[PDB]
Design an enzyme around this catalytic site. Sequence first.
Site, PDB file in Angstrom:
ATOM      1  N   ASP A 164      -9.069  -2.174   0.496  1.00 22.34           N
ATOM      2  CA  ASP A 164      -8.861  -1.332  -1.110  1.00 22.34           C
ATOM      3  C   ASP A 164      -9.410  -2.137  -1.115  1.00 22.34           C
ATOM      4  O   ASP A 164     -10.292  -1.051  -2.412  1.00 22.34           O
ATOM      5  CB  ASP A 164      -6.903  -1.500  -1.423  1.00 22.34           C
ATOM      6  CG  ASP A 164      -7.018  -0.596  -1.703  1.00 22.34           C
ATOM      7  OD1 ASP A 164      -6.386  -0.243  -3.070  1.00 22.34           O
ATOM      8  OD2 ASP A 164      -5.497  -0.810  -1.067  1.00 22.34           O
ATOM      9  N   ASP A 178       0.980  -1.120  -0.342  1.00 19.96           N
ATOM     10  CA  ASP A 178      -0.171  -0.174  -0.154  1.00 19.96           C
ATOM     11  C   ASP A 178       1.063   1.188  -0.159  1.00 19.96           C
ATOM     12  O   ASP A 178       1.300   1.718   1.110  1.00 19.96           O
ATOM     13  CB  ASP A 178      -0.820   0.176   1.173  1.00 19.96           C
ATOM     14  CG  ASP A 178      -1.504   1.424   1.557  1.00 19.96           C
ATOM     15  OD1 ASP A 178      -2.962   0.913   0.693  1.00 19.96           O
ATOM     16  OD2 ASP A 178      -1.687   2.119   1.954  1.00 19.96           O
ATOM     17  N   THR A 205      -2.953   5.879  -4.725  1.00 23.86           N
ATOM     18  CA  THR A 205      -2.089   6.723  -3.980  1.00 23.86           C
ATOM     19  C   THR A 205      -0.707   6.085  -5.125  1.00 23.86           C
ATOM     20  O   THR A 205       0.051   7.185  -4.879  1.00 23.86           O
ATOM     21  CB  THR A 205      -2.510   6.301  -2.898  1.00 23.86           C
ATOM     22  OG1 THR A 205      -1.472   4.834  -1.925  1.00 23.86           O
ATOM     23  CG2 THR A 205      -3.288   6.271  -1.984  1.00 23.86           C
ATOM     24  N   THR A 206      -0.326   4.970  -5.296  1.00 27.77           N
ATOM     25  CA  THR A 206       0.883   5.073  -5.987  1.00 27.77           C
ATOM     26  C   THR A 206       0.751   5.707  -7.379  1.00 27.77           C
ATOM     27  O   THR A 206       2.093   5.874  -7.572  1.00 27.77           O
ATOM     28  CB  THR A 206       1.359   3.019  -5.883  1.00 27.77           C
ATOM     29  OG1 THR A 206       1.202   2.706  -4.468  1.00 27.77           O
ATOM     30  CG2 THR A 206       2.020   2.798  -6.847  1.00 27.77           C
TER      31      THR A 206
END
Lengths: 78, 502, 503, 503, 78
Positions: free
Chosen positions: B372, B43, B76-77
């Site tokens: 997620d 994450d 987010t990555t």
Amino acid sequence: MMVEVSKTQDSFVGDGTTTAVIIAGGLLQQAQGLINQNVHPTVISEGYRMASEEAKRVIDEISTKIGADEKALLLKMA
Amino acid sequence: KDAMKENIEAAIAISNSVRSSLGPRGMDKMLVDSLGDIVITNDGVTILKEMDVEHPAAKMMVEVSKTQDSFVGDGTTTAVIIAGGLLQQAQGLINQNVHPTVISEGYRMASEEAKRVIDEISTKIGADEKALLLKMAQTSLNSKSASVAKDKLAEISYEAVKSVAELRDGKYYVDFDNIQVVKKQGGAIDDTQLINGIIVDKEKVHPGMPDVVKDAKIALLDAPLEIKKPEFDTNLRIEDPSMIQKFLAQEENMLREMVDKIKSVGANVVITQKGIDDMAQHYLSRAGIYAVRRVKKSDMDKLAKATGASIVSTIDEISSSDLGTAERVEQVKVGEDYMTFVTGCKNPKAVSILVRGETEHVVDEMERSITDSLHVVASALEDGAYAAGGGATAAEIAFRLRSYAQKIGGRQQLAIEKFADAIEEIPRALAENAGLDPIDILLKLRAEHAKGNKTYGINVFTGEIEDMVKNGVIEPIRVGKQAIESATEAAIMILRIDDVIA
Amino acid sequence: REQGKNAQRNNIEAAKAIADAVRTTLGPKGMDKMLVDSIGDIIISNDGATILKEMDVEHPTAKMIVEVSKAQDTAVGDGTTTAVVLSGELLKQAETLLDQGVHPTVISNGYRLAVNEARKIIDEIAEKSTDDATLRKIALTALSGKNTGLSNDFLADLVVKAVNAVAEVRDGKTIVDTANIKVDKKNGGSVNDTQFISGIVIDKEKVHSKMPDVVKNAKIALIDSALEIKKTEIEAKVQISDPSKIQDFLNQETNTFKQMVEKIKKSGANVVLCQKGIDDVAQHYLAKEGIYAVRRVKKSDMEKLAKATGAKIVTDLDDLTPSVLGEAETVEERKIGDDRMTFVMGCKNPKAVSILIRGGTDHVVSEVERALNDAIRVVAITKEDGKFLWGGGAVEAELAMRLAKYANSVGGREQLAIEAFAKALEIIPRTLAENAGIDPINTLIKLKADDEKGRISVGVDLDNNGVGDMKAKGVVDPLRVKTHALESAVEVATMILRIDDVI
Amino acid sequence: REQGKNAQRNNIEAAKAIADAVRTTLGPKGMDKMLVDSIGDIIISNDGATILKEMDVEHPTAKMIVEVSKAQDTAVGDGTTTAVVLSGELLKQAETLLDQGVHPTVISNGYRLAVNEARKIIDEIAEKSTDDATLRKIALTALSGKNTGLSNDFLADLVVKAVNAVAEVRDGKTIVDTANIKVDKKNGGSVNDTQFISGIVIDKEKVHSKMPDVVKNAKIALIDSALEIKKTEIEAKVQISDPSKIQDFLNQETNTFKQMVEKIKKSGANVVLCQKGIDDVAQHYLAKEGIYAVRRVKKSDMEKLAKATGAKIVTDLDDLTPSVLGEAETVEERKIGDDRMTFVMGCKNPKAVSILIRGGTDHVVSEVERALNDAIRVVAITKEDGKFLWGGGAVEAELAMRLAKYANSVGGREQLAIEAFAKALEIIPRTLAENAGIDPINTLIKLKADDEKGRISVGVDLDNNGVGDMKAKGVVDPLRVKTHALESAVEVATMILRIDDVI
Amino acid sequence: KMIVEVSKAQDTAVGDGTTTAVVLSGELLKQAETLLDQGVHPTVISNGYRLAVNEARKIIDEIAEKSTDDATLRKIAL
Ligand SMILES: Nc1ncnc2c1ncn2[C@@H]1O[C@H](COP(=O)(O)OP(=O)(O)O)[C@@H](O)[C@H]1O
Ligand SMILES: Nc1ncnc2c1ncn2[C@@H]1O[C@H](COP(=O)(O)OP(=O)(O)O)[C@@H](O)[C@H]1O
Ligand SMILES: Nc1ncnc2c1ncn2[C@@H]1O[C@H](COP(=O)(O)OP(=O)(O)O)[C@@H](O)[C@H]1O
Ligand SMILES: [Mg+2]
Ligand SMILES: [Mg+2]
Ligand SMILES: [Mg+2]
């Protein structure tokens, strides 16, 4: 190694050592981009080699024989 | 000049720290804080919120992570990878004396156009809601180590959200305070299950309380069961040796009466946020009341919504109308520990997911990975549309931005095109991470997309540029728009700062 | 911070190391480790989890491998060494696939395939049986590399018996709540003197000399509170204005204790087990009443006792009615060793027993206890599962043979990955052999063939000095332990495999 | 200690430096600075005063230049960068006159003459207008070099509207108390979601769940005290001699809170905004009564609310009569972003509004707020003054041209001094250009001529890439800001000029 | 230092192949580390490598392709 460039350009021709260096940086800074995209340094070296060859050809092409204006032509160069 | 050069680099650095975790051939990170706490995860928000960043620019890039996480939950990555792209690209443009204002406008305009495109190339979720949503849940699980059981976890993720999802104006709404997610080690991943009800990781406060109550009247307190000492300086004056017992009896009576009140109103279970006095404990126990204590506030709320209870903080006024309802409450041993399961809640739109993992650090990621999915199937459900994944949509937006660039021509155009190259970061990362040749895949990717193949992405398993919606790699439209949103807002901020001092 | 190759190989190196730290404790011819701290001091054990919980691991990755021993232990009881050694081997075997170019993920997928597959083969080849005859066998084997003496058969028998005495049956299946088996220990030299008490033993003395040395047909009251003078929650002060009152107040105190005792007697209780303290004056009268009291009884115990005798733990002596008293034919204090202990036998509820461990030294009793626990846990599991496996490298050798075959029926990269898992499984046989001092390689070579010819049960026969028939020797591995070991190992191996950058 | 030349040149060097620190933030194509402390941390802004208040200035002289930004800001709102840059230039220009032999004093007298003169030319050439059309223009320009997005037109409009909604008229003139405009912000991403609330917004939640989610036609009671159990100033102690009383005393407490609530209900108030705390039992009954309460309300707010709704802030609930309650058509809690906030709309007094700023990140909302404030302040001023000037180097170029002419009509030394002030004024055009990336010198050369030919309004046109007609582009500088900038700069420049010895 | 010795030998004795001989020695030592961990004795490993190499020393000489024409001499060069 970059400085090695300077002396050599100086050696053969005499004018253009600042030019040679500026280009060597360009080529290197550009290869820096290509290198990020996983382009192999062999590919980049060949491409650079081929472009170079073509570049000298072009100069010969776009060049101009010094005619009877030798005097003012040479003066303009000086 | 330099402040900028330094900032951009510091920033790009954080980006790269996360790049390798993008996609199905993504790698994970191990993070050990000062205290020796280890967090092994994929994450990116966690990798970011976790790492020890000092450079202010780096902190700003991390600011991206949390925000993308906040609004959407997955991506987010992705946001970080793009913010690095944009910054690395602006780095080039900056060398050519392109003013950071021009670059910021260009970036802004490209961004706007990028979100438009996503809306355009998007696809309303049709009657295939089930398998579409399942396909989404899985793609999410594909990057995480939970892939191992993506099929089961995805069904669970789909089941859980579908349950708490209220379809109001022909439009869905998902309140996560209706999905209780607990993690308990000592079981394989496949062992993760969906429990209709709210599981609380708390056992009964006294050995004598029953292990199960059927048709429970849940009394929820936000006050401790103890004798109330006045607010004024109070002191007992005993001049007669007889008074001593009279006083001690009175104090026990006060506690014995608190229990009576809760009991009198028909309460069957007493779940409190605070403590339960030892003597009060005896009483509840004796009354046959199943009581838990020092319960987590977050949990308190979930039990409320579920059972339709009300969190009483004034026991003296606990009314019958304040009681929650559940078909049965029972203490069950979840492996080593004893948990309290409130099943058959008054409100059926409340459910729990019990993440099982053989090891602490294992079950921890398992819990992150599932959250997620939930956020995905949920976000998808709500939005109503989805875009093709695997870099297809990125390659698409990249394609369309090169055109718009030619329209909104000028220096602006240079910025708009760089924005395109930057978005292309995703396909590059995805390819790189697997082992695919980025430049080759990227070239083939451009071709198909040029030829109007708006869904051709990188099938990281075959290495071919196939149809992403077909092969099922799809993601909620919401993920994509924010990443590009958060990403451009970082790039612009870092891009206007020409000096950083203390 | 370490990125890529560095991080990974380094991580595999860490796991490997922690894994070897326990490797030599595997099997019968196992060795022990001696961990020494700063105050408590010397701890000598063969137990995997112990050697590690106590070990001072620093490297993160190593801390993760340690996590599996603690899990294996608390979740399944036996197998802590195995799960560690196995995680070390799966990470090690992967390091080759890594160097060849295989991606950590596909390796992680091979291990999934492999383990999921093995999780079927074993369940396919598992051998059902619940008779005491084999329960006894599970026991004998669980006590092997441990320093328990020659008494193992005696100990095995105690365990089988204790498990059987507490095993209950519900909707058709047998349940064994290991919590109903109270194990304790006391230095007195013997190991054979290990008593099997059909009741609950409490390492406590009666609080007062004059109390009955023994109590037949006992009405047992369990008390949450302390039989002591309590003070009102709101600060109090006593103002004496008359000299006379000074005595009256001192009497209230006495009469307070007298009544506490009175409430107790009134209930019918003749035995008082108090989780908290007891005042000397309370003691005076409990003794005068002839009630056998014990103070500061461990809550853990207060609970087992409540369950065994059927008593209700009461705090307010006002709710101490005959209805909440427990039952035991006899409550007697008896001197076990240097210590006097309280024996509660003939409990209302028979499904509650004890194993009072004896043995000398101290260091020998602790371990014998640790050994007896592994035995208790697995005998219990086996009682429930009714299935077991062929011990001493057998199960592994088979799984390895079958898995290497299943590998071929799988893709290119994943095959490589599953062949790797097949080899990792051979680590156990090799280990048992190595420790025994025999030749790993040949043992393996021979073991493969025999299992290949269909001899499922040929394990590493230390006696025959090589391979042999575990069926005969009766070396049996409980199912649940194998599976959790395998599953635990794969989950943790995968976790570490994906870490490409440690910061 | 530094005497004479040393001190002076050194002082001018200091001022110059601090002045350049903000120079690049000037105008549209401005840049931002990032100041980072030790805990709070990163602050990114374009605001002059901010970059300096937060900056760690050490040199005394530099601290003085910083003083003008803080003054410019609190006194006139816009122009903090300008006043700093200008002080730097007047001190710099003087350093030449100094080297030539001119005495600091006569230089100080030239600057007086010059500034006093310019203070007339501008007021002479100032352009009157109060229409929303131009108020909107003042706004757009005040938001230029700031990171506000593309929404500026939207923001400009909010500002014009807020100013107009609170602008009052008294004896003929318009007054705009900027205090009636409450600006707030909330992270939620949007910038367009910036709401203009025709009322007062309070970043607070109702104290108790069961309280009405919304209250129509509200009677609002503002309370100074905390609805909690109070203790007598003279230490008190309660002596309970009878067990019974222990409860009675616990009840007094309850009945105390019940009455507080009763007083409140009796007044007619259905909404209670408490500057201090509220006890959970008070909350119980306020909720039971159905009154919407909010605790720990900021005094700043307590005051705006009092003014907007017409309520009187009462401490003693005994003086809580219907006469002192405020009015609002609706008092409703609504979730803005992650936060729940209390919306008070339809206030008895309309001249009180809010601007709830949205925008994402955090770092973007703070600045957008800073930008919106400059806009609010100048739009307000302009509303009152009704006069403005031609922005983007225009005003300066003109002043410089005229002042250099006035210089000739002045003595020898003072002329030199006023010619110096004329040049210092050209620092703005040059700066705007430099930042834009264009050619300072030519820009100046071209700008001079156009203004010389009478083109007052030709400013530095970044778009035209040089000079241009600010009239068209609508770049307008508010009067009051120019003047305070000029006056502030001269006063501080003079102060520093006389210092011949720093010790 | 010993692995380095083979490059210097390969070079002075045969001219080409210095990289190969080094990389190969690294791999034979690496591959052996497994056989070592399994229990195989260094010596028998040394004997396997003998057998193997002696064998390969025949297969290659068996499968070697004869030719001395400039056509291929040119190929060796390239
Ligand atoms: N099966 C797949 N094949 C190709 N690409 C995939 C597949 N599954 C996911 N992806 C892509 O990998 C990226 C998601 O990787 P992930 O590590 O989860 O990043 P993020 O944190 O942004 O969600 C997305 O761009 C997604 O579309
Ligand atoms: N008598 C025996 N003969 C052969 N193998 C045995 C014997 N006893 C135990 N083993 C084997 O030793 C291994 C377990 O060793 P042990 O010390 O108990 O470690 P663990 O903590 O993993 O149970 C198992 O494969 C088991 O079958
Ligand atoms: N759109 C514009 N075009 C030309 N000049 C502008 C424009 N906007 C602002 N300016 C000029 O920039 C200067 C003020 O810049 P600013 O960043 O607001 O600093 P300050 O704190 O002094 O207000 C003024 O001369 C102003 O007129
Ligand atoms: Mg994802
Ligand atoms: Mg064992
Ligand atoms: Mg301004």
